[PDB]
Design a protein around this ligand. Structure first.
Ligand SMILES: [Mg+2]
Ligand SMILES: [Mg+2]
Ligand SMILES: [Mg+2]
Ligand SMILES: [Mg+2]
Ligand SMILES: [Mg+2]
Ligand SMILES: [Mg+2]
Ligand SMILES: [Mg+2]
Ligand SMILES: [Mg+2]
Ligand SMILES: [Mg+2]
Ligand SMILES: [Mg+2]
Ligand SMILES: [Mg+2]
Ligand SMILES: [Mg+2]
Ligand SMILES: [Mg+2]
Ligand SMILES: [Mg+2]
Ligand SMILES: [Mg+2]
Ligand SMILES: [Mg+2]
Ligand SMILES: [Mg+2]
Ligand SMILES: [Mg+2]
Ligand SMILES: [Mg+2]
Ligand SMILES: [Mg+2]
Ligand SMILES: [Mg+2]
Ligand SMILES: [Mg+2]
Ligand SMILES: [Mg+2]
Ligand SMILES: [Mg+2]
Ligand SMILES: [Mg+2]
Ligand SMILES: [Mg+2]
Ligand SMILES: [Mg+2]
Ligand SMILES: [Mg+2]
Ligand SMILES: [Zn+2]
Lengths: 60, 122, 66, 193, 135, 81
RNA sequence: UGGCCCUCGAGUGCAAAGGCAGAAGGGAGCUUGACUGCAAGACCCACCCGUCGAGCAGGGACGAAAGUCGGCCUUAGUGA
RNA sequence: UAUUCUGGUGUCCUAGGCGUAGAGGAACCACACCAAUCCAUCCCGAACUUGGUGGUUAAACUCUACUGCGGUGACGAUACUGUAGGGGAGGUCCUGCGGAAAAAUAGCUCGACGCCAGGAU
C-alpha cells in the first residue's frame, strides 16, 4: 500500500556473467514508505562479489 | 540538576567512566584539570591501584616550566611526556583514555598527543 | 557575539539632547537626537506637584467671588 | 519626589563607566555599608536581562516574525531567538514546534548598556509615565516590567513600524530579597512608584 | 443508601471472610457502641434500617456514627437464566465485617436509652452482636 | 464486552539460582524489563535476557540501594571427598 | 519568559504489564551493522515451530581512542 | 618506617541524606575579575574553549558536632501457616508437634576500607 517492498541492487554489478571467482548480482531487500520519501532510496551496503561496500540503488 | 560547574563535571566524569574501565592489560589514563594545576593518574581498577601519577606539583616540571595563571598547552605536553616515560619504564604500553569529564580539546587534546608521540598506546 | 548574524553594535553612541547636551551611551546608531530624557523630564518634581495639588473647590469658589 | 536620576543626568559621561564603573565605584561601597555585609561578594550583581516578545499570532505570518526579530535586534543590538511551543494547545490553535514568541538574553556588557538605554532613554520617552511598580519583584530579588508598545526606543523608527508589538523585560539579580534588589535598581536610576 | 460513586470493573470476587478485624476494634468517636460478633456481609439497606431505627428511638439524644460502609460490589444472574454467557449484573452493595468490628457509635444519652436503642438497631442486623461501653 | 482471549504463559523467570553452576552462554534469567542488572562476567541480551560468560557459581547482589544485579564467579573444586 | 519549593509523580509511535533520571527520556553532529560468511553453549519444548548468544573471518560506520554497532526499552504486528 | 592534613581516585555498605551550629585560605580546591586568533552558543564567552590578573572564603567543597526531620530496626507476643486430629447446618472455629511475620515501640544512625601525589611531624 503506502508501505512497500523495495529491492536494492548493486549499481556496479555486471549481469554479463563476470570472469572472477564468485559471480552474481547483489540485491538486498527492505521496506520504504512510498509517500514519506518519494526519492529513490540510495544506500551504501556490502556486496559479496565486489567484496567492498558499494552503492545499492533501486529497481522499478 | 547541579548547576555548580564542579558537580556538573563530576556528572560527566561518571557518565564517561561508565564505558571506560581499567584492566591489568589496559589501565585507565585519568585527567584532572583544576585552575592552577594539571594532575594525571594511571589506574588498574581490578587491583584498585594507581601505577603512575604525574602532576604539576612535582619538582621535575616545577624546575622545568613555570607559568602565570592557568596551565598552558606547554605544561600539558611536558606532563604527557613525563607520564609516557614513567609508565614505559614499568612495562605499561597499551592503556585507555579517561577524559575525566572535560571535552577532548585544548590541553586535554595536547596531553593525549604528547603521550602518543612518546610510546604510549591509546 | 557571533560574527555577521547580529546587527552591528557600535560601542560609541553620542547622546545629543537639544539643550546642547552631549553624553555617551551605546547602541546601533552613532548619534541619538533626543527630546525629553531621564534628567529633564517632569517625573521627579513637577509631576508630583501637578497630580497631588490639583483639588480645592472651596478656594476655587472664593477666587471668583470673595 | 526623591531624585536618584539627578545622579544619572549628573555630568557629560561615558557608557562603560556609567554602568560598570559606577557599579564598582559608587554602588558597591553604598550597598556594602548600608546592608553591612561581612564580605564583598555578597553584593547584589545584575546577572542577566532577558527580553521576551510574546506574539503567538506571528506563527501564522512569518514576515511579522522576521520584522519583529529585526526590531528587537536594532533595539538590543542582538539578533533574536525564535522560541517554539513545546506542547499542542487547543484553544490557542497551537501544535508542537510552532514558532510562538521571540526571546533574547542580554549578558555581560550589553546587559548594562541596554539597561542604560532603558532607564535613561525609552522609559521617559514612553506614553504617559508615573513610575514602574515597586511591587513587580518576585520575592527572590528578580524584577520584571512590561512595555505595551515598542515605539519607546529611537532605534525603532516609528513611521516605518507596521504594528505595535509588546515587550517584556526580566532583570535577574543574585539578590535573595526584594529590599536589596530595589535599592540596587533605584540607586542605578530606576523610577519607582 | 450508602454506595461507591465509581469503580473500573463492575464485577468482583466473592472473596473469603476470615479472622478478626483488629483495626475497627476501638470506640473512638462516641460513648456507647454496637459491636459485630460474627463473620458476615452487610447490605447497605440493613445499615440504613439500623441507623434509622436507632435515630428514631433515640430522637432527643444526640449523635450516631456509622463506622462502616458498603464498597464491595455484588452481582446476580436473572431468573430462568441458563448458566454461561457471562457474569451477571451488580444489584446491590455490601460491607464485609468480621468479629470485633464496630458498627454503630452513639452519644448524647443515658446508658438506659442507649441499651434500648442499640437493641432495636441490632434487630435489623443479619448477625449476632454486642453492647459495649467506651474506655 | 465479551472476554475470554488470553496468552500462553511465556516462560520467563530465573533459570539458574544463586550458588548453582553455569556454562558459558547458559541463560540465567529471562525477564521482561530489567528486574535484574548485569554484573561482571555476565552479558545482557536484546530482550534483557541475562547470560553467563564464564563457568562458575552465579551470585545475586544488592545493586544498591534498592535494585539487584547478578554476576558469575569462578569457583574452585578441589575438595573431592 | 524569569525565579523558588517537591524529586521521578512526565515521557517511551500504539494496549497493558515489567523496565528506564546526568538514564532506554529531550537535542545536536556524522552515518547505513535495517551487513556477507557463520557459530560454543543455553532456554522453551508432543511434533512442527520459537527465543538468547559469547566467539571467528571478511568488508565497513561513528569515534581522538578505549570501544559500540547483525534494526528498533522488552513482550503483539502473522501463516507450514 | 610511622602519623596528620590537603587534592585526586575507587571498592564495600546498614545507602551516611536533609537541617542547625562551628572550623578551613601558607599549600590545595573553588569561585571573583579581565581579554577573546584554537573551539564556543538554534539568541547570549552563561556553559564549553585558549590566555592573563591577583581579589575573596560570600557561594561551593571540605572537616568536627547534634536526633529536629529522614533512613534503619529488634526481643517478645500475636496474625498466618506445614503436618497430626477435632467442632460447626454452614459462613467458619479449636487442639497438639514444627516454622514464623507485617505493624508498632525500645534502640541504631550523621558511613567503612584502599591506592596515588603533595606538604607537616
Ligand atoms: Mg584559569
Ligand atoms: Mg505606580
Ligand atoms: Mg486462629
Ligand atoms: Mg487489614
Ligand atoms: Mg439477627
Ligand atoms: Mg500471561
Ligand atoms: Mg547486539
Ligand atoms: Mg500506553
Ligand atoms: Mg509503565
Ligand atoms: Mg538517548
Ligand atoms: Mg569480540
Ligand atoms: Mg558479536
Ligand atoms: Mg569485524
Ligand atoms: Mg577514522
Ligand atoms: Mg532509540
Ligand atoms: Mg542502617
Ligand atoms: Mg550506619
Ligand atoms: Mg562558605
Ligand atoms: Mg530520628
Ligand atoms: Mg524515624
Ligand atoms: Mg519473635
Ligand atoms: Mg496448625
Ligand atoms: Mg486437619
Ligand atoms: Mg503453632
Ligand atoms: Mg519457635
Ligand atoms: Mg524478618
Ligand atoms: Mg517492622
Ligand atoms: Mg566521621
Ligand atoms: Zn556488486
Amino acid at each position: 500500500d503506502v508501505r512497500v517492498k523495495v529491492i536494492l541492487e548493486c549499481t556496479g554489478c555486471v549481469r554479463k556473467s563476470v570472469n572472477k571467482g564468485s559471480r552474481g548480482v547483489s540485491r538486498y531487500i527492505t521496506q520504504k514508505n512510498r509517500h514519506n520519501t518519494p526519492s529513490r532510496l540510495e544506500l551504501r551496503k556490502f556486496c559479496p562479489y565486489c567484496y567492498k561496500h558499494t552503492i545499492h540503488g533501486e529497481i522499478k | 540538576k547541579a548547576h555548580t560547574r564542579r558537580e556538573d563535571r563530576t556528572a560527566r566524569h561518571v557518565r564517561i567512566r561508565k564505558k571506560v574501565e581499567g584492566t591489568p592489560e589496559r589501565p585507565r589514563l585519568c585527567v584532572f584539570r583544576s585552575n592552577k594545576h594539571l594532575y594525571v593518574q594511571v589506574i588498574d581498577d581490578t587491583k584498585m591501584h594507581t601505577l603512575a601519577a604525574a602532576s604539576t606539583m612535582q619538582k621535575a616540571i616545577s624546575e622545568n616550566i613555570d607559568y602565570s595563571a592557568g596551565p598552558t598547552v606547554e605544561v600539558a605536553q611536558k606532563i604527557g611526556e613525563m607520564i609516557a616515560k614513567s609508565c614505559l619504564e614499568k612495562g605499561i604500553t597499551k592503556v585507555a583514555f579517561d577524559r575525566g569529564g572535560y571535552p577532548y580539546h585544548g590541553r586535554v587534546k595536547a596531553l593525549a598527543d604528547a603521550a602518543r608521540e612518546h610510546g604510549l598506546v591509546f | 557575539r557571533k560574527s555577521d548574524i547580529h546587527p552591528e553594535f557600535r560601542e560609541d553612541a553620542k547622546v545629543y539632547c537639544n539643550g546642547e547636551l552631549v553624553m555617551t551611551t551605546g547602541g546601533t546608531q552613532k548619534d541619538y537626537t533626543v527630546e525629553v530624557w531621564s534628567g529633564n523630564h517632569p517625573f521627579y518634581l513637577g509631576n508630583r506637584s501637578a497630580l497631588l495639588l490639583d483639588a480645592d473647590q472651596v478656594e476655587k469658589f472664593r477666587k471668583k467671588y470673595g | 519626589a526623591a531624585g536618584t536620576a539627578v545622579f544619572v543626568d549628573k555630568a557629560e559621561a561615558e557608557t562603560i563607566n556609567r554602568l560598570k564603573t559606577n557599579y564598582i565605584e559608587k554602588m558597591v561601597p553604598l550597598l556594602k555599608e548600608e546592608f553591612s555585609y561581612s564580605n564583598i561578594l555578597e553584593v547584589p550583581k545584575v546577572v542577566k536581562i532577558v527580553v521576551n516578545c510574546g506574539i503567538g499570532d506571528a506563527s501564522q505570518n512569518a514576515k511579522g516574525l522576521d520584522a519583529a526579530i529585526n526590531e528587537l535586534a536594532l533595539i538590543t543590538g542582538q539578533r533574536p531567538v525564535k522560541t517554539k511551543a513545546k506542547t499542542s494547545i487547543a484553544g490557542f490553535k497551537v501544535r508542537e514546534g510552532m514558532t510562538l514568541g521571540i526571546a533574547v538574553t542580554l549578558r555581560g556588557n550589553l546587559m548594562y548598556s541596554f539597561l542604560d538605554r532603558l532607564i535613561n532613554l525609552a522609559l521617559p520617552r514612553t506614553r504617559d509615565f508615573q513610575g514602574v511598580n515597586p511591587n513587580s519583584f518576585d520575592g527572590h530579588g528578580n524584577y520584571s516590567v512590561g512595555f505595551r508598545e515598542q515605539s519607546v526606543f529611537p532605534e525603532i523608527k516609528p513611521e516605518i513600524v507596521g504594528k505595535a508589538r509588546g515587550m517584556d523585560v526580566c532583570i535577574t539579580t543574585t539578590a535573595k530579597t526584594d529590599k536589596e534588589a530595589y535599592k540596587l535598581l533605584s540607586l542605578m536610576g530606576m523610577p519607582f512608584r | 443508601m450508602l454506595s461507591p460513586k465509581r469503580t473500573r470493573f463492575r464485577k468482583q470476587h466473592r472473596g473469603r471472610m476470615k479472622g478478626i478485624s483488629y483495626r475497627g476494634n476501638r470506640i473512638c468517636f462516641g460513648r456507647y457502641a454496637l459491636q459485630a460478633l460474627e463473620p458476615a456481609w452487610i447490605t447497605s439497606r440493613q445499615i440504613e434500617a439500623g441507623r434509622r431505627a436507632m435515630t428514631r428511638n433515640a430522637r432527643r439524644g444526640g449523635k450516631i456514627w456509622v463506622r462502616i460502609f458498603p464498597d464491595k460490589p455484588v452481582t446476580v444472574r436473572p431468573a430462568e437464566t441458563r448458566m454461561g454467557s457471562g457474569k451477571g449484573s451488580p444489584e446491590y452493595w455490601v460491607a464485609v465485617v468480621k468479629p470485633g468490628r464496630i458498627l454503630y457509635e452513639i452519644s448524647g444519652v443515658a446508658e438506659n436509652i442507649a441499651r434500648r436503642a442499640v437493641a432495636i438497631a441490632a434487630s435489623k442486623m443479619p448477625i449476632r452482636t454486642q453492647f459495649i461501653i467506651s474506655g | 464486552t465479551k472476554n475470554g482471549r488470553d496468552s500462553k504463559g511465556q516462560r520467563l523467570g530465573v533459570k539458574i539460582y544463586g550458588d548453582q553452576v553455569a556454562k558459558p552462554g547458559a541463560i540465567i534469567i529471562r525477564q521482561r524489563g530489567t528486574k535484574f542488572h548485569p554484573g561482571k562476567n555476565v552479558g545482557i541480551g536484546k530482550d534483557h535476557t541475562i547470560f553467563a560468560l564464564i563457568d562458575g557459581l552465579v551470585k545475586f547482589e544488592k545493586y544498591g540501594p534498592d535494585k539487584k544485579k547478578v554476576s558469575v564467579y569462578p569457583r574452585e573444586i578441589q575438595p573431592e571427598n
